[PDB]
RNA sequence: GUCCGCAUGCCGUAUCGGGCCUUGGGUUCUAACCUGUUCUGUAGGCUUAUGCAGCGGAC
RNA sequence: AGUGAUAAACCGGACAGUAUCAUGGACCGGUUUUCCCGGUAAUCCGUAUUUACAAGAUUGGUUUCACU
DNA sequence: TACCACCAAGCCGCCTACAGATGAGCT
DNA sequence: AGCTCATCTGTAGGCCCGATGGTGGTA
DNA sequence: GGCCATAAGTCAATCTTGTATTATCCCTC
DNA sequence: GAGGGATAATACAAGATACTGTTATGGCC
């Protein structure tokens, strides 16, 4: 088994093979479809038919080659970049260059032996992309709302026109998301179970499903809550902001309007916890119950809480 | 002469009068048209005819009251908020650094006697409003344009549609600005003089007018350079202390923002610009340091030309 | 007919800025020397300046001679805390810092703020403080070498031991020098005896307190003295003499632990639910206030009042 | 066959964690005493642990005796830079319970990395470094008092003058004690003579350099000794976009880095080979202190070079 | 009711330190070239939230 | 200490933002310092958007409960 | 009358000015 | 043998630990 | 079956990669 | 003569004040 490290850039790839005997092989490639073919050819050139490849999450510049090597039939791992930086410091490295990083990643692979990566389902990729687009347009719509507060009279026609455009466009995406989840019989069913939870509506169901996916990729619900950066360490905040920000207003709706939510708020209030500390706790709980309900395959039963 | 201070908020006003004798008269008001009428009456109630009012520039909530008192005929000073905080710290070592109350503003007014404020011409306000809007739409366009780079294919129809809208809207505002400056013969002429400067185009001239204004508010061109936050901040003391000169940045950000690309166009493509670039480069100045220097020069020539009242002359450089 | 004068000070040079009643400025630079200081007094009297308020920032000890020179000439002198000067320059909206700008900034500070006048301290006050701060300097150095013995290699120990002996001997020499100083003067002898009467204050703390309070009662209220040490909260401000605050911590600790009036104070705050160091912080402030109080009363400490 | 052991050391206690080949752990705490260390060795020999690789943090003087003990017992001992330990913890997960490193973590550090073996210094190497470090302490105290002389009150001056005389005498005594140490050892005498042959390196710097280089040549290349002193430039590059500015890394012994500044200033100013080097970089757009930083690195590298070569400084090579 | 006097209550997390560890990247390849801003120090200044409560005195 | 179970309990302060304010040090002519008066589109002192923007990554600690 | 162990727990200042080191060539 | 002068904006990471003074109690 | 008001409000995740602005010159229909 | 593309610059640090929106549910028409 060889151990390969790839540093990624927009234009180039730096590759570092670490052979069983211990010697290295290094080569640069263009980060293109042609270059990716040159890479696989080069590996099979040196009779490397079994290898574990390690690569940092670097924008979306690492995604094409990761899929290419997965299809060629290698074990690919796409590591969190923060681990890589810490590992470099554990190795005592005194420089940051592309060839240094590529070699560092081969060692990371060998020593740590990280979990294998799997390309998401096309529908999961599509759903995620729409949910991310929807958040962007909501942010822009909120920016333009803030402006109406202090807008001059001459500025106001321009702002009103943009708000109309943004509202139509948000409405269009919400339909595109609905059509996506309705077509797939799995997603249609899984979304309806999420919405059974009091506090989770149309919007929050789409975001949860976009990050949970189709299959059960988490073994336990507490892992999903960790993935969202909601577990304490203060909250770690080591997880997707898009997922975490989506849960805040549902947390308020639950703690206030819903029966099971109030119960949680009251118990924590009795122990002496402040407003946002309870909301923090409820965010984590919603995440954890969301993954719970899906595993069960059964509508939200309030009796358990 | 009385010295009044007004601490402003969205909803409420807080007023503190300082009498010549030294006694105070304080009263809170609503921040409404009705509220502002009570204030003027309450001052004229206590036979306060001549006063110097000092308000701090918190935003658009304090503009109506400032205009109200200016019309009532009092002297109004609208002060930079950072001066207020600094003044409080000059008044003692153990002062609260999260408040400047109406009393503090009355003392500020007495000690410093700040320069009088003047309500901008309706035409100047309109121009500044459109220019500020244009910059906001430019920023939103840049955001969406950055997103095209890495966008997923399902996202691209949405982003493309938004870019078309934003481009059309930007083009509408540009025409709306042009129509404003053309309809006033003072602005039409002043804008033509600015655009005679190599490196100043349609977009930059509109910014420069919005801040320079109709009248000549500044006595000297160097003051306008300071106003934009472009002059180098010297830091020297005795023999030991020798800090490095840097751009002060203590000035209007929207001006400072507008001049960086003009500066880069001047030093690269124009004769008078390259001349300046070469001299500083010889003297050992780095690339972006020369841009900073050219930004200040453009500001200072912009004001100079308008004073001179004649097109840009290269012979002066 | 009062002029306003600002002086920015350096090791070598002075930068003077006279602001006249009519509102115009006169400026000149002088050497920071005895000869230079005489030229300044002459230059002022050559412009017919008899009355003037002079403002100068505390800048090491490089401004102490000129401040004394002008005070003798009959001018009003203010020595301002330089943190105030900086804030004022910001309030004035200045965009540069030079020796010429600062001299002009200080003349305006003088005109606008009209700060309190400065009084040159008594030679005895000036000597007592000199000895006390030197004593702390040696204590800090002794503590350094004492830390070193913990982890010292064997070959280093003869050197460290030798230094500890020398420092201990020197510390006794100063303690005697301080005792001799506050025995010759009848006023200091009485006042030092009054301070020691407080349970929690001994030989060392008494001399520190006497150095900062001084001979004459230059504070109006007790909390003013507590603020001068930086003990009043705002969480403690720290905006005061660190050498004075330093000196009260261990006195505070022995007071709350092994005195009647201290334990009484500790218990009161313990009942209301305060942490250990919060009570010490509180006792430091209280010790400062009582110390000042006892002196103004002029009678030994009485526990009844607390 | 090989076990991996981590030890977490405090002043009073030792926490030990043995990682067995199979994967199970053994844990037992000990006193940080001579009795404790003998108990530890017996406990390992109890469980038939003959070959092991122990990993300890370099926290100071409290961990040195147990390291000595285990080295003599015949185990492989590694004494790691604590900053590596903290970084290793963060490489194991994103949301660890604590940032603290424990004996278990150290045993895992040992397994994954197999760090280089530690070697107990020679008594004379230990003596020399101790004296040199004492000399730097007294120099700093002497500097303090010199600064005070400037702005002292006249009543304070008798005390400051007295202390200065004492410190001057003690520095002089301790310099002679260093000279007597190196003169008595024929190896150290020769190596010190070689270092002084370099223009820019005198008595004070040669002693510092020996204290960190030592009797035997531990570094494979001279550039590694420059890295050891923290004198090499740290590059920061990625892709087209990311491009930081190279600065002195400073990841290394401050004592070395402190010692070489004035030699570098003497070399670039007064010596033939150092003026040559100054002039070349000054021909490029390099500032004074930038050139000084470069010369500091060069002196470290040449110092180690000359010792390895075993022959006095040859100017021809520069 | 008002104005002063407080060694009063409420508010208060001091300050100085010490020791130890550190085996670059690229190149024309290791005492060469490109890439390099040391280690620390010193002195001085600091006048209430009397804000609110108590308590005492005067009118 | 390891393994399994967990929609329970203890630990938990989310994101995104918006608007607005800013009159150099000095130099060149008079006076013969500055100030003041007159002049400054020149020279020396300058690392923009006082947080420029975009994208991607993130599989808890512990307590109960079983088994070794 | 002189000597000794103990209290608290490691969690945060703002400014205005200053200075030293070592080694090689020159007196 | 003693003296002078060469450098000026600021910015590595971690882990282990100790002393101060004054008083009541003890010898 | 459709529309509005309300709940919280002091302060602090880590990294790996990218790109825009305006105005004048220059080349192409 | 109008329309569109290419181009210049790169280590980062260092002022204040006033404010607002998100979603999902149980209430109301
Ligand atoms: Mg990378
Ligand atoms: Mg000064």
Author numbering:
A (entry chain C): 5 to 237, 250 to 321
B (entry chain D): 5 to 321
C (entry chain A): 4 to 237, 250 to 321
D (entry chain B): 4 to 321
Text from the published report:
We recently discovered that IS110 family elements encode a recombinase and a non-coding bridge RNA (bRNA) that confers modular specificity for target DNA and donor DNA through two programmable loops. Functionally, the IS621 recombinase associates with the bRNA and catalyses recombination between dDNA and tDNA at a central CT core dinucleotide present in both DNA molecules. The IS621 recombinase consists of a RuvC domain (residues 1–122), a two-stranded α-helical coiled-coil domain (residues 123–188) and a Tnp domain (residues 189–326). The IS110 synaptic complex comprises two recombinase dimers, one of which houses the target-binding loop of the bRNA and binds to target DNA, whereas the other coordinates the bRNA donor-binding loop and donor DNA.
To understand how the pre-HSB bRNA precludes recombination, we determined the cryo-EM structure of the synaptic complex with the pre-HSB bRNA. The structure is similar to our original structure, with the top strands of tDNA and dDNA cleaved to form 5′-phosphoserine intermediates. However, in contrast to the original structure, the HSGs in the TBL and DBL form the expected base pairs with the tDNA and dDNA, respectively, thereby impeding top-strand exchange.
